[PDB]
Design a protein around this ligand. Structure first.
Ligand SMILES: Nc1ncnc2c1ncn2[C@H]1C[C@H](O)[C@@H](COP(=O)(O)NP(=O)(O)OP(=O)(O)O)O1
Ligand SMILES: [Mg+2]
Ligand SMILES: [Mg+2]
Ligand code: NA
Ligand code: NA
Length: 327
DNA sequence: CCGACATCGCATCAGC
DNA sequence: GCTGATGCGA
DNA sequence: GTCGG
């Protein structure tokens, strides 16, 4: 449905969502507000009353009232007030820095630190993730065009095969679904010598090579199975340098790779749909495995999976190209 | 009336 | 020192 | 905040 159809309402609900997470520390009210924002933004009619919207799953009494006040006054008093609030609005803002959550932001604002400049003055009070978050605050809220993503995929698949040609890597996320832009790069990785019933060196060697050719520039976190960091395309000729980008690389056992690929390909709402279909079918799907329920409710052993399609077959669903997995 | 609401790897903190 | 908890991003 | 056992 069109943007400014009920855009005024969904912006209201998303604002309310973020204050719940970042200021009130009420994570379930956060998800609640977003569930309503989502179900309304897909509703193909301009909403006339709070009662009209209350018919949608996720829209209860309190949001129905808020919609009324909005439709009648063009604003929400509680939201207007909380926007005015110097403490609460500063807390909400600081959480836009990756590494700073609802709790850290609460602390900074307590001891007087409210803005980016305040963060820049106080580097010694920040940890490694947060410094990188501050350093790339602007870049991180930018989107990545598919053309850049393709160029990034080139570098990654190249350097990975160059380390060891038996590696298997797949760029998942929205990129794999064909999207015209992406928020980050989600890379999945496996090797024929790494399974469930089974070398930690496998992930480290890939990160290292990518740092060598200077594709990876910073590191947020890194273990034996998951890498979170920053990456940048090399800049061409004398043209303006590319934004720094968020990139994830995680090493998955060969056994669990395609449950991994399928899950991390998304979309979000496709996953929950395909998890519940799926449920009436007597199977249970997580990111690792698919297991059979289970005549009382016991899970049997993990079932063998050697492609995405296998998992589609178990639950008797027609395989669907990542292109169509928007839900 | 009252609990569930997605889930997990990693960094750092709190406590011993 | 170690172990578990907590915060964080996704 | 919403839904439902
Ligand atoms: N809450 C959730 N429930 C089910 N799957 C989820 C999930 N959160 C993440 N995933 C799975 C499904 C997601 O598709 C996949 C990648 O996570 P992202 O990179 O955070 N989201 P995407 O890459 O699609 O879009 P973009 O990055 O351009 O903003 O991880
Ligand atoms: Mg992504
Ligand atoms: Mg991601
Ligand atoms: Na409802
Ligand atoms: Na943040």
């Amino acid at each position: 449905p069109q943007e400014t159809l009920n855009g005024g309402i969904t912006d209201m609900l998303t604002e309310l969502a973020n204050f719940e997470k970042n200021v009130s520390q009420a994570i379930h009210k956060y998800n609640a507000y977003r569930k309503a924002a989502s179900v309304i933004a897909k509703y193909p009619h301009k909403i006339k009353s709070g009662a009209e919207a209350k018919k949608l799953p996720g829209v209860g009494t309190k949001i129905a009232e808020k919609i009324d006040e909005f439709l009648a006054t063009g604003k929400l008093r509680k939201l207007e007030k909380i926007r005015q609030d110097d403490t609460s609005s500063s807390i909400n803002f600081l959480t836009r820095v990756s590494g700073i959550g609802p709790s850290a932001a609460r602390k900074f604002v307590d001891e007087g630190i409210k803005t980016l400049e305040d963060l820049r003055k106080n580097e010694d009070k920040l940890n490694h993730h947060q410094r990188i978050g501050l350093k790339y605050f602007g870049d991180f809220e930018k989107r990545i065009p598919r053309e850049e993503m393709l160029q990034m995929q080139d570098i990654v698949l190249n350097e990975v095969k160059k380390v060891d040609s038996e590696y298997i890597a797949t760029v998942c996320g929205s990129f794999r679904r064909g999207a015209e832009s992406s928020g980050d790069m989600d890379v999945l990785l496996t090797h024929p010598s790494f399974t469930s019933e089974s070398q930690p060196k496998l992930l480290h060697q890939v990160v290292e090579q990518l740092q060598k050719v200077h594709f990876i520039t910073d590191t947020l976190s890194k273990g034996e199975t998951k890498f979170m960091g920053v990456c940048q395309l090399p800049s061409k000729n004398d043209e303006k340098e590319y934004p720094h980008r968020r990139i994830d690389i995680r090493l998955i056992p060969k056994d669990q790779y395609y449950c991994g690929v399928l899950y991390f390909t998304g979309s979000d709402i496709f996953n929950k749909n395909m998890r519940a279909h799926a449920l009436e079918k007597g199977f249970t799907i997580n990111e690792y495995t698919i297991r059979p329920l289970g005549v009382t409710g016991v899970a049997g052993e993990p079932l063998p999976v050697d492609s995405e399609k296998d998992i589609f077959d178990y639950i008797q669903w027609k395989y669907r190209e990542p292109k169509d997995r928007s839900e």
